[PDB]
Enzyme design. Structure first.
Site, PDB file in Angstrom:
ATOM      1  CB  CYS A   1     -90.572 -54.392  34.149  1.00 42.13           C
ATOM      2  SG  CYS A   1     -90.842 -52.889  33.183  1.00 42.13           S
TER       3      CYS A   1
ATOM      4  NE  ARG B   1     -88.053 -53.669  37.391  1.00 44.03           N
ATOM      5  CZ  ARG B   1     -87.410 -54.477  38.225  1.00 44.03           C
ATOM      6  NH1 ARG B   1     -87.759 -54.497  39.506  1.00 44.03           N
ATOM      7  NH2 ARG B   1     -86.418 -55.253  37.794  1.00 44.03           N
TER       8      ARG B   1
ATOM      9  CD1 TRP C   1     -90.247 -46.271  26.001  1.00 44.57           C
ATOM     10  CD2 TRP C   1     -91.619 -44.901  27.120  1.00 44.57           C
ATOM     11  NE1 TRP C   1     -89.554 -45.778  27.081  1.00 44.57           N
ATOM     12  CE2 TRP C   1     -90.375 -44.938  27.787  1.00 44.57           C
ATOM     13  CE3 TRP C   1     -92.642 -44.101  27.643  1.00 44.57           C
ATOM     14  CZ2 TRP C   1     -90.128 -44.208  28.949  1.00 44.57           C
ATOM     15  CZ3 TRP C   1     -92.393 -43.376  28.799  1.00 44.57           C
ATOM     16  CH2 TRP C   1     -91.151 -43.435  29.438  1.00 44.57           C
TER      17      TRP C   1
ATOM     18  CD  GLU D   1     -91.140 -54.830  24.759  1.00 50.42           C
ATOM     19  OE1 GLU D   1     -91.969 -55.517  25.400  1.00 50.42           O
ATOM     20  OE2 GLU D   1     -90.985 -53.587  24.891  1.00 50.42           O
TER      21      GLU D   1
HETATM   22  C1  HEM Z   1     -91.903 -47.198  30.198  1.00 52.98           C
HETATM   23  C2  HEM Z   1     -91.344 -47.996  29.275  1.00 52.98           C
HETATM   24  C3  HEM Z   1     -91.299 -49.533  29.439  1.00 52.98           C
HETATM   25  C4  HEM Z   1     -90.443 -50.326  28.789  1.00 52.98           C
HETATM   26  C5  HEM Z   1     -89.364 -49.845  27.800  1.00 52.98           C
HETATM   27  C6  HEM Z   1     -90.687 -51.701  29.197  1.00 52.98           C
HETATM   28  C7  HEM Z   1     -90.004 -52.822  28.760  1.00 52.98           C
HETATM   29  C8  HEM Z   1     -90.325 -54.115  29.114  1.00 52.98           C
HETATM   30  C9  HEM Z   1     -89.865 -55.322  28.469  1.00 52.98           C
HETATM   31  C10 HEM Z   1     -88.907 -55.376  27.256  1.00 52.98           C
HETATM   32  C11 HEM Z   1     -90.403 -56.367  29.107  1.00 52.98           C
HETATM   33  C12 HEM Z   1     -90.148 -57.835  28.718  1.00 52.98           C
HETATM   34  C13 HEM Z   1     -91.444 -58.489  28.267  1.00 52.98           C
HETATM   35  C14 HEM Z   1     -91.214 -59.331  27.041  1.00 52.98           C
HETATM   36  O1  HEM Z   1     -90.222 -59.074  26.316  1.00 52.98           O
HETATM   37  O2  HEM Z   1     -92.044 -60.245  26.777  1.00 52.98           O
HETATM   38  C15 HEM Z   1     -91.229 -55.868  30.194  1.00 52.98           C
HETATM   39  C16 HEM Z   1     -91.971 -56.603  31.105  1.00 52.98           C
HETATM   40  C17 HEM Z   1     -92.925 -56.159  32.012  1.00 52.98           C
HETATM   41  N1  HEM Z   1     -93.288 -54.824  32.256  1.00 52.98           N
HETATM   42 FE1  HEM Z   1     -92.331 -53.175  31.422  1.00 52.98          FE
HETATM   43  N2  HEM Z   1     -91.730 -51.696  30.116  1.00 52.98           N
HETATM   44  C18 HEM Z   1     -92.139 -50.369  30.280  1.00 52.98           C
HETATM   45  C19 HEM Z   1     -93.170 -49.924  31.091  1.00 52.98           C
HETATM   46  C20 HEM Z   1     -93.970 -50.647  31.953  1.00 52.98           C
HETATM   47  C21 HEM Z   1     -95.149 -50.182  32.669  1.00 52.98           C
HETATM   48  C22 HEM Z   1     -95.744 -48.756  32.571  1.00 52.98           C
HETATM   49  C23 HEM Z   1     -95.618 -51.210  33.382  1.00 52.98           C
HETATM   50  C24 HEM Z   1     -96.811 -51.261  34.350  1.00 52.98           C
HETATM   51  C25 HEM Z   1     -97.066 -50.244  35.167  1.00 52.98           C
HETATM   52  C26 HEM Z   1     -94.746 -52.336  33.166  1.00 52.98           C
HETATM   53  C27 HEM Z   1     -94.871 -53.582  33.717  1.00 52.98           C
HETATM   54  C28 HEM Z   1     -94.287 -54.732  33.231  1.00 52.98           C
HETATM   55  C29 HEM Z   1     -94.628 -56.057  33.680  1.00 52.98           C
HETATM   56  C30 HEM Z   1     -95.680 -56.434  34.753  1.00 52.98           C
HETATM   57  C31 HEM Z   1     -93.734 -57.011  32.875  1.00 52.98           C
HETATM   58  C32 HEM Z   1     -93.737 -58.551  33.043  1.00 52.98           C
HETATM   59  C33 HEM Z   1     -93.193 -58.754  34.461  1.00 52.98           C
HETATM   60  C34 HEM Z   1     -93.386 -60.120  35.071  1.00 52.98           C
HETATM   61  O3  HEM Z   1     -93.975 -61.056  34.427  1.00 52.98           O
HETATM   62  O4  HEM Z   1     -92.913 -60.236  36.242  1.00 52.98           O
HETATM   63  N3  HEM Z   1     -93.765 -51.964  32.287  1.00 52.98           N
HETATM   64  N4  HEM Z   1     -91.160 -54.488  30.154  1.00 52.98           N
HETATM   65  C1  LIG Z   2     -95.893 -51.811  29.713  1.00 48.88           C
HETATM   66  C2  LIG Z   2     -95.018 -52.585  28.765  1.00 48.88           C
HETATM   67  C3  LIG Z   2     -94.192 -51.917  27.873  1.00 48.88           C
HETATM   68  C4  LIG Z   2     -93.394 -52.662  27.009  1.00 48.88           C
HETATM   69  N1  LIG Z   2     -92.581 -52.023  26.133  1.00 48.88           N
HETATM   70  N2  LIG Z   2     -93.437 -54.020  27.036  1.00 48.88           N
HETATM   71  C5  LIG Z   2     -94.235 -54.688  27.894  1.00 48.88           C
HETATM   72  C6  LIG Z   2     -94.253 -56.080  27.897  1.00 48.88           C
HETATM   73  C7  LIG Z   2     -95.075 -56.756  28.798  1.00 48.88           C
HETATM   74  C8  LIG Z   2     -95.163 -58.246  28.820  1.00 48.88           C
HETATM   75  C9  LIG Z   2     -95.271 -58.972  30.003  1.00 48.88           C
HETATM   76  C10 LIG Z   2     -95.384 -60.355  29.928  1.00 48.88           C
HETATM   77  C11 LIG Z   2     -95.418 -60.939  28.667  1.00 48.88           C
HETATM   78  C12 LIG Z   2     -95.334 -60.121  27.542  1.00 48.88           C
HETATM   79  C13 LIG Z   2     -95.366 -60.691  26.134  1.00 48.88           C
HETATM   80  C14 LIG Z   2     -94.966 -62.165  26.071  1.00 48.88           C
HETATM   81  N3  LIG Z   2     -93.497 -62.297  26.075  1.00 48.88           N
HETATM   82  C15 LIG Z   2     -95.225 -58.844  27.679  1.00 48.88           C
HETATM   83  C16 LIG Z   2     -95.875 -56.024  29.675  1.00 48.88           C
HETATM   84  C17 LIG Z   2     -95.862 -54.638  29.664  1.00 48.88           C
HETATM   85  C18 LIG Z   2     -95.038 -53.972  28.773  1.00 48.88           C
END
Ligand code: HEM
Ligand SMILES: Cc1cc(N)nc2cc(-c3cccc(CCN)c3)ccc12
Ligand code: HEM
Ligand SMILES: Cc1cc(N)nc2cc(-c3cccc(CCN)c3)ccc12
Ligand SMILES: C[C@H](O)[C@H](O)[C@H]1CNc2nc(N)[nH]c(=O)c2N1
Ligand SMILES: C[C@H](O)[C@H](O)[C@H]1CNc2nc(N)[nH]c(=O)c2N1
Ligand SMILES: [Zn+2]
Lengths: 414, 409
Positions: free
Chosen positions: B107, B110, B279, B284
């Site tokens: 993430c 964070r 958000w 994405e």
């Molecule tokens: C606040 C704005 C946030 C933004 C801009 C953001 C952005 C992202 C992005 C771009 C990814 C990559 C996933 C993908 O592209 O497939 C990601 C992953 C992830 N996010 Fe965030 N996120 C946000 C908030 C959060 C919140 C609130 C949570 C949970 C409390 C969270 C938990 C996670 C988790 C668990 C992953 C995958 C991590 C893993 O597999 O180890 N995120 N996030």
């Molecule tokens: C809370 C949050 C915000 C955000 N903008 N993207 C997320 C993206 C994910 C995420 C985690 C694992 C896999 C995926 C989609 C497959 N690439 C999304 C989880 C949470 C998100």
């Protein structure tokens, strides 16, 4: 330690099966509890008891590759290499083994995207070199041959192997052809900011710099442990491409050009426990190597700004993505210039496509293909290339190309 | 022993000590790196896991070894005895949920981890209740476009045959349909899930951007369908600040990204249903949701309207069309006052976040492969940032898709 490992392509759902990782040699830096995958770099010259098994490992591999494993010749070679080590603490490679080794160092190089070409590599034996002037002779021939008037051909020149560690051959240049960087008293940099340090070394060793934007550095060459010596590469031998744009007439006015031959010369070739500290190799370019890294990196030419200025992009908020728009145009110019001047070059789409095809074939008929996703994915538009979605196993096979300390940091001056 | 991470573009070096504290494995060995691989309890196991979490909780609020700490340990031990499990206090729950986000290696967002609204839904017993908690989550998180981070935590897994599950991968997604000829109407990523709803009697509008119904499973029972009240689904029509024709592509996306199929793990307890939302980072939607081949795949169409020559790859036409799409997305969200972030600002925040974590915590687990944005990578600060990756707990984990396990009833 299980016998199979699978890797999935999440875009095409193709699964491959890796067996080759079982032949992995040295540790990766990673552990059960941490991953160093994005760490760039995670005189103990070998003894006899160290060299025997390393030599045997490689020779067995060599005879396996040519379907003579267990043959008379195979056993005789082992007997000869083992006697040679016992009474000289070293051994020499036959020309065939040397050629094999080079090609497989390339083939084994997890970070190289262009490996589909690996078998097609021209190997120049220069193990009979004894002096800097000779090194220079060999390097000039390497460059003319590799350049081929624009129809670039991959090639490696291999100088004598390390002996006691005090008599190393080195090319001090990081690439055979690079542009000088000159630090200015006012804090700016003229030329290439990447090569500022090496430029000062050259200047201190006697180089008279033209102090220009695109000054080809001289070769700094060390033979047999001696102090290194300066040599000017003949300007006719350095092929260069002026950068212009298919649509932007003003792009030529930026005044940029780049050289055609990427020739890395500071890496170390390791074959059967032998260490070739001086082993320059060359191919052709991927566009993002010049377009994204050489030009747009902050600590490089940084014309990102100026291009955006001439495109009249809004550069006050990042969310206009002016940087991205600019970068794309710059990479279009680079590819268009090289192609117009019929100089060989590959775009990041074509290359990543090639490598996926290469990886599949390697898995099919070699049991796997070590790869470094972190380096294999291009620095721009990664997700829309086939390698982004492609799972990869990373491990270290020998023969390999390795990193080594900069020679100036280790050299005992005479 | 301690470990360094260099940023190569700024030569800044950080020292990691935090990695020494983990005990979950990464999938790598000494001889193989699997950093690009996407996916590499009884009484007896449960107490030390709880003890570990309770300890870092009382260490967090600087009362390690307090009267409360000693007692709380006793209270938890006695409860694992006589019930083969235990229940988290409210405080622990909120601490644990914030720290699972904090420990999320992949993430990039964070920097925001301590700002998390935590909704306790552990009293829930039915799908209808779940639906109520979910609507409330969506209403709060969407906040009329000033999005806020939230998580809703449903009861913990017990025997395994009584799991709570949100079958949707996200609370708000678009339906995808397999066409008769072969192509796909709507979002291809969800085509399987759409058929599962159609099987349950969902009447598909069979359109491009149909909002999928919720599929909710409580106490292990059959999942049930619920329509999300449309006034609660904030959507954005995508248009372009220079190109007039871009709106004639008829594109639109939802404002709220809310991942609902992961599993929160705290102190040895498992929460199989815990939708969390934040958000969007613009890539994405604009890079992955719209341009991936296994997705909406509209690059060809856009570059066609941009009248580029698409015969050879080296014209970088895919590259141009991609940037223009992400400009649109960002422009569209910001015009509708809907919280979004560009990949430049997001990466900047994360480098700053990393530095913070290395200061106050001794490290920050991070997966470079997922942190680096899927476009324009090396012109973001995180490209040249070395990162250590390790598995801290509490964490969000992957779990199997529920229709692969659930015996229907
Ligand atoms: C606040 C704005 C946030 C933004 C801009 C953001 C952005 C992202 C992005 C771009 C990814 C990559 C996933 C993908 O592209 O497939 C990601 C992953 C992830 N996010 Fe965030 N996120 C946000 C908030 C959060 C919140 C609130 C949570 C949970 C409390 C969270 C938990 C996670 C988790 C668990 C992953 C995958 C991590 C893993 O597999 O180890 N995120 N996030
Ligand atoms: C809370 C949050 C915000 C955000 N903008 N993207 C997320 C993206 C994910 C995420 C985690 C694992 C896999 C995926 C989609 C497959 N690439 C999304 C989880 C949470 C998100
Ligand atoms: C022929 C066309 C070739 C292409 C298009 C190509 C492309 C690339 C690229 C883009 C990189 C990443 C480096 C960077 O980002 O600066 C790389 C790395 C590398 N290449 Fe290739 N390359 C080619 C030929 C060769 C040859 C001929 C050799 C040796 C015989 C070689 C050995 C390596 C090694 C050792 C690395 C880096 C591995 C490491 O740092 O450990 N390459 N290549
Ligand atoms: C032969 C060849 C061709 C090519 N197009 N790129 C290379 C790139 C490299 C390379 C390897 C490690 C590091 C670097 C640049 C340092 N950032 C380049 C080595 C050889 C190459
Ligand atoms: C920090 C990071 O590991 C390092 O800067 C790497 C990342 N990936 C790369 N990939 C390529 N092709 N070239 C590079 O120089 C780098 N740099
Ligand atoms: C194979 C590869 O690991 C996989 O496709 C990952 C790579 N990195 C990613 N990074 C992000 N942010 N999102 C992704 O979906 C992926 N996909
Ligand atoms: Zn690893």
């Amino acid at each position: 330690c299980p016998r199979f490992l699978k890797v999935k392509n999440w875009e095409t759902e193709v699964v491959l099966t890796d067996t080759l990782h079982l032949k992995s040699t040295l540790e990766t830096g990673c552990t059960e509890y941490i991953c160093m995958g994005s760490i760039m770099h995670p005189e103990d010259v070998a003894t006899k008891d160290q060299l025997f098994p390393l030599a045997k490992e490689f020779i067995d591999q060599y005879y396996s590759s040519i379907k003579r494993f267990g043959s008379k010749a195979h056993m005789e070679r082992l007997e000869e290499v083992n006697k040679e080590i016992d009474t000289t603490s070293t051994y020499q490679l036959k020309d065939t083994e040397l050629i094999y080794g080079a090609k497989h160092a390339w083939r084994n190089a997890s970070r190289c995207v262009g490996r589909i070409q690996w078998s097609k590599l021209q190997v120049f034996d220069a193990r009979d070199c004894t002096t800097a002037h000779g090194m220079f002779n060999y390097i000039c021939n390497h460059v003319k041959y590799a350049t081929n008037k624009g129809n670039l051909r991959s090639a490696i020149t291999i100088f004598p192997q390390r002996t006691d560690g005090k008599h190393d051959f080195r090319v001090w240049n990081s690439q055979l052809i690079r542009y000088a960087g000159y630090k200015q008293p006012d804090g700016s940099t003229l030329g290439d900011p990447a090569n500022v340090q090496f430029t000062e070394i050259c200047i201190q060793q006697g180089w008279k710099p033209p102090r220009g934007r695109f000054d080809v550095l001289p070769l700094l060459l060390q033979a047999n442990g001696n102090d290194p010596e300066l040599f000017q590469i003949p300007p006719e031998l350095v092929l260069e491409v002026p950068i212009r744009h298919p649509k932007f007439e003003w792009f030529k006015d930026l005044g940029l050009k780049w050289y055609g031959l990427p020739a890395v010369s500071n890496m170390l070739l390791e074959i059967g426990g032998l260490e070739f500290s001086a082993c320059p190799f060359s191919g052709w370019y991927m566009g993002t190597e010049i377009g994204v890294r050489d030009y747009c990196d902050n600590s490089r030419y940084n014309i990102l700004e100026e291009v955006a200025k001439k495109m009249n992009l809004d550069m006050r908020k990042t969310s206009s993505l002016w940087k991205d728009q600019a970068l794309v145009e710059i990479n279009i110019a680079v590819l268009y210039s090289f192609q117009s001047d019929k100089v060989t070059i590959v775009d990041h789409h074509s290359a990543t496509e090639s490598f996926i095809k290469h990886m599949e074939n390697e898995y099919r008929c070699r049991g796997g293909c070590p790869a470094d996703w972190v380096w294999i994915v291009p620095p721009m538009s990664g997700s829309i290339t086939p390698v982004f979605h492609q799972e990869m196993l990373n491990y270290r096979l020998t023969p390999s190309f390795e990193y080594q300390p900069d020679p100036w940091n280790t050299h005992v001056w005479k």
